[PDB]
Design a protein around this ligand. Structure first.
Ligand SMILES: CCSc1ccccc1NC(=O)C[C@@H](C)N1Cc2ccccc2C1=O
Ligand SMILES: CCSc1ccccc1NC(=O)C[C@@H](C)N1Cc2ccccc2C1=O
Ligand SMILES: CCSc1ccccc1NC(=O)C[C@@H](C)N1Cc2ccccc2C1=O
Ligand SMILES: CCSc1ccccc1NC(=O)C[C@@H](C)N1Cc2ccccc2C1=O
Ligand SMILES: CCSc1ccccc1NC(=O)C[C@@H](C)N1Cc2ccccc2C1=O
Ligand SMILES: CCSc1ccccc1NC(=O)C[C@@H](C)N1Cc2ccccc2C1=O
Lengths: 274, 274, 274, 274, 274, 274
């Protein structure tokens, strides 16, 4: 059955970004931690955020981390589950579970997997009829934001289109440090220079690189058995066995989407003359 | 279940237009408040109106306000409800509820979401058999009036194709006043200049702008905690993050449709020679 | 349920045409009123006629009027009913009702709305197995006569393709008189000059014009209250709000269809040499 | 329910052709009337014939007449029945009825109405498993022989593709004599010259002409009432109200099909040198 | 129900070919009559063969004859049965019947009539799980071998793609002798010259010719009654009504397929140098 | 029912390759045989590999052999089983059987046969919810790797895309030795030169060649009866009866895919400067 627990992931786990972290805080923590000014001002707290960006960059990581920050249960519904709903009334049960688990951060991973459909409109019906007062917060993830119908992007539903970009160099070394730890590693590992060589490898690609280096370590030690730490040569040579999943054209079209939403923000000099 | 109550919205809440207000009064109030001349003249009161225009302009606001004016119950059926009936005889139950709640203003929000279909034809069957004597009044809203089948525009059904344009400058400041109010705001808010710099922002866009200014106020005050009114700088720095949802081409083709229906009205000099 | 009653409409109500009146008389009245020569001659009376023409010209009016002439019940099955049968065995019950109500003029309004289909084939099965002896007479209407499958136009079924053109000028003023009557109207209404200005407005358009004039009268009187006759200015200023529903291209292609059926009739000089 | 009776139609009714009469005789009468030589020779009697030709030429007439000649029950299944089978296991019941009614001439009118389908393959299954010994003979009719799948034209099924052409001049006058008879007619009716002026009118068209002339007779007599025989002028003028249903292009493509099946027969000089 | 009996057809009935006969013996007889060497060698007997070639050439005749040679039951499943299973778990019952009837030669006539499908996949599932030890032998026939999914041509399924060409002149006279016999025929029938003048007539066409000659004999004798052997003039005057069903282009593309499978076999000079 | 047993195939059987042998060893044996370093290092063992390559190269052979090496049960689900799942909840039963049989090597043969579908999504759901701790290891096979949806290639699922190329010349003679063995063969058989002539024959093609040689031996011995060793002439001549199943274009595009995955691996000089 669905697991409803507080994720152990933390902001330190993912160093991919910092502005998105603060935006998520203001979006989620403030309505629940400080429910004082929202009633004072003409603010109706947003109950929906949609994450978009290249695949395997940490959208699930961001959702889990923000759930951890507020110590609110986290419920994840995978894409295959929505697809079996499509091929296969239980969306109401999912939402009632989330409600009874409040405060909660419901998560819809790759909700665009189906891409007006039975399950999607059922989700819309259940989301619109959800009391915004309750602590339930809904987050969706999709690496193909364009193909999602706009009926989910209307007010009272998922509003904020948050972009999760490819990690930067400092961010990349942060993700590497996060992944390698909890296992033996040489005290003279480059890490930073490891990040610099990484041009456009996503978090998934860095995890794959670390996995391959560990695998080479196991192979070497197992051969020696018939050595207590991951030597430098492992990462030194395994990087030949590394590939960039996301093509530069994909990043450029993601940036085209972002620049569209930015030129939408392009309106300027309005400054209330004094 | 469906909520059947008199909306608290009022004409003051929306200042987008005035002639539409008057024609809505003549359409709805007159048959119910003054059922004295309709039977005198060869007039069969209209019982259906279809709103069309760019999305997020106040069609729902108009319907709620006109329901409030007559103090008649208001029943809304969202697009997702029709779509789930399409995917999923409940239309009959909806109409019986409306009948038992008479006087009432049944509202079909974005009824073109389905776009000859099963549910739409059931709606037509229930509407044609509805006694015009009863006070029930049916209103439909659609942001894409062209794709709607003509079977709904026939006499005895939704006849009046009303147009809801973008709010004008004075209307825009009226909407800003109607929305911003009920929350702290600086006494020296320009508002009028705020409306003038808004070129083609719809009511939804103005609401988003106000919400963003309020959000910035909350963030600033929360930082100060670790201030009691929405400063001017909030609006000044939030407008740069204001985007016009409806494109100029969309308004141009809406005006093309309106000009088609107007040149249909273009017949002129007939003046009953005397 | 289906209404089985003698329509109160009369030939006086519709002046659109006169030849069709006599042709319908010979089609319907003669087999029932004078069943003396049909068995004498080698003629099997026709039990089906299909009306075609631009929409809103009075096809239903003609059917109701001819039913009134013979004082025979009239059963109407609207397009939404056929289409809900299509989406949703009741055709047999409809025909049994017609039989038990004999003499009757069953009417299939816009039977081409479905456009070989399940309901169409069931209707054909019930019509072929219907005893031509019984007084029941079947009439169909279709604004789109071409898309109708030929399976219904075979002998023993809907055979006579009657055309209902736009009302003539004198016929237009006849329709005006038929409509505005039963309500106050100024003794000095031109009517004839009103019809002359009407270039190609159908009966529905004239009804809309009269309704708009009555609306203006209602509004003016209600304003005056806060006058007992529809003044000339009402029609004078409502005509500018009159639009011709049927485009001249539609009338031209209708006339192309008629000229096709006429050139089929174009065989000439055969004159029985003697 | 299905009617199983010996048709009263006779060869004298239809003078459309003579060779097809003899071919049908040899195909049907011989296997049943004189079942002697078939066993002697290496002949397996054919149990299927498919009629093709322009519509309304007498395929049903031919089937009924041949059934009459052998005094064998005749069962007809209309196209709408097959279509309701398609949209709607009763084919087995139809075939068992035909078997129990043996000798019988089962008739499938416009069996190509559906045009590999459920009902058609069910018919194939029931036909292949039908004992050729039994007197049952199956005849199919289709005015669109090309669109019929070839699975029905294999040996052991409908073999003989019999063409039913447009009636000749003498045949046309024979058809007229068959039609106008049994009702009053002037002793000085052309008939022969009536046929000559008829260029390409099918049997259905000639029946329509006779029906229209009778209709004019009824109209004239009933007008005189407010004359005991169909005068010459009725046919003289009603022929202006006559049309040729089948276009010359349709006849030419039917003849293209026939000439294909004839050049298939084009093999010549083989004469067994002696 | 399915008939399971040893066919009475024999190799003498069909003289279309001889090498195919021998290879069929080696395929079927050897595993069952002489199960002595297969286990000695690394030979897993084939349990599937697919016949392909122009229609009406004797594929069913070949299957029946080979079943007769081994005196093993023969089960035939016609194409309509597969199609009705497709439209309509009976494949399992068919295979259980074949198993209980072992030794048997299951035959799937025109199994490509459906042309990955439900029934064909069920057939594959039942065939793969069939113990090759058992005497059951599966043969499929299809005159359109290209459109058949390759899933059936894998090892452990129908392997051998056997080709059945048009009968040769000597083969044609053999077929004529096999068919004409058992009925009176003149002692001076050339037969051989009849075969020579037959250019590309298939077995079905030769059977049609014989049937037509017999029919003419019946007609002549039946006329003479109102003679005891089939005269030469019957064949002479019936040959002119003989048509070659299979076009030259069809045989050419069949030979294209055969030449493809032969050039695949075209690998040559490999000869084990010694 | 599904068979759960340790395959008797061994690495000595298929000599098609050597590198994939060690790769599969490190993938499967190490996590179960020596589960000492996996928890020490930060590596989560992979629980899924997907085989791709030209058909009939031994993918099933590799899976069975690797299952044999660890002495773990082996469950195979064929393509027709998945397709009857698609046309026909039992995937869960399959996985429960695999779990209860742990350690096991579940095999999905030609899982791309279906080519987001119901069965594929159910398989993904069952695979994601499968505890990686358990010894169960999942292997998939597809000779059309491109058409497979990427939903199965994400981390935590079938991850390692292993390529099974055409056997090398030494490998080809190894396969010949593995196949021909267990049956009589001459002591003076080329084998090596036999392999050299084999340019691009896959394992299935070599099996076909051996089967044809055994067939010829069977035929010659059976003729001689009416010799106890497979003579050289059998292979000498049967090679003229052999064909290469895989076209050089297919291998070229397979190598195009391989070179794509290699250029993805093309990142080079990263060598940890020191
Ligand atoms: C917004 C890019 S979404 C995306 C991301 C990764 C992988 C695939 C996709 N979708 C597509 O490529 C579909 C094609 C038609 N694109 C291209 C494109 C560029 C800029 C703006 C919008 C579009 C769009 O709809
Ligand atoms: C009437 C515009 S309705 C509309 C409004 C907002 C967003 C989308 C739409 N529909 C479309 O764009 C479909 C395309 C095909 N249009 C364009 C157009 C211009 C003028 C008149 C009629 C049409 C029409 O059918
Ligand atoms: C017979 C016109 S019925 C009609 C009437 C009003 C509105 C629409 C329609 N149908 C169409 O326009 C379909 C198009 C393809 N037409 C044009 C036309 C001219 C003359 C003859 C036959 C055809 C026909 O099939
Ligand atoms: C054999 C004429 S069947 C026919 C008869 C009346 C009315 C309609 C039809 N069908 C068609 O017209 C379809 C078109 C594609 N034709 C034309 C044609 C000429 C000669 C030979 C074969 C074909 C054929 O398949
Ligand atoms: C192998 C001939 S199969 C056949 C036999 C009789 C009647 C019809 C058919 N199929 C077709 O005609 C379909 C078309 C597309 N062909 C032509 C052709 C020539 C050579 C090789 C392969 C093909 C093929 O797939
Ligand atoms: C990836 C080749 S899988 C394959 C193997 C054998 C037989 C058939 C197939 N599939 C195809 O041929 C589909 C066509 C469209 N190809 C060609 C191709 C070359 C290189 C890279 C990718 C593609 C691809 O998607």
């Amino acid at each position: 059955e669905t697991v409803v627990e507080v994720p152990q992931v933390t902001w330190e786990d993912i160093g991919g970004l910092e502005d998105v972290k603060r935006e998520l805080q203001e979006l989620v923590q403030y309505p629940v931690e400080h429910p004082d000014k929202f009633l004072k001002f003409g603010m109706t707290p947003s109950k929906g955020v949609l994450f978009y960006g290249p695949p395997g960059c940490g959208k699930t990581l961001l959702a889990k981390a923000i759930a951890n920050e507020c110590q609110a249960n986290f419920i994840s519904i995978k894409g295959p589950e929505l697809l079996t709903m499509w091929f296969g009334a239980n969306v109401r049960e999912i939402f009632d579970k989330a409600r009874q688990a409040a405060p909660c951060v419901l998560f819809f991973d790759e909700l665009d997997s189906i891409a007006a459909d039975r399950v999607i409109n059922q989700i819309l019906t259940e989301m619109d009829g959800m009391s915004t007062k309750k602590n339930v917060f809904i987050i969706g993830a999709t690496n193909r934001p364009d193909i999602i119908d706009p009926a989910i992007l209307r007010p009272g539903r998922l509003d904020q289109l948050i972009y999760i970009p490819l990690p930067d160099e400092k961010s990349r070394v942060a993700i590497l440090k996060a992944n390698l730890r909890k296992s033996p590693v040489a005290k003279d590992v480059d890490l930073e220079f490891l990040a610099k060589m990484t041009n456009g490898f996503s978090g998934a690609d860095l995890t794959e690189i670390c996995q391959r280096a560990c695998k080479l370590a196991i192979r070497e030690s197992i051969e020696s058995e018939i050595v207590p730490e991951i030597r430098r040569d492992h990462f030194e040579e395994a990087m030949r066995f590394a590939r960039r999943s996301v093509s530069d054209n994909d990043i450029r079209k993601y940036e085209m989407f972002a620049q569209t939403l930015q030129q939408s923000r392009g309106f300027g000099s309005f400054r209330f003359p004094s």
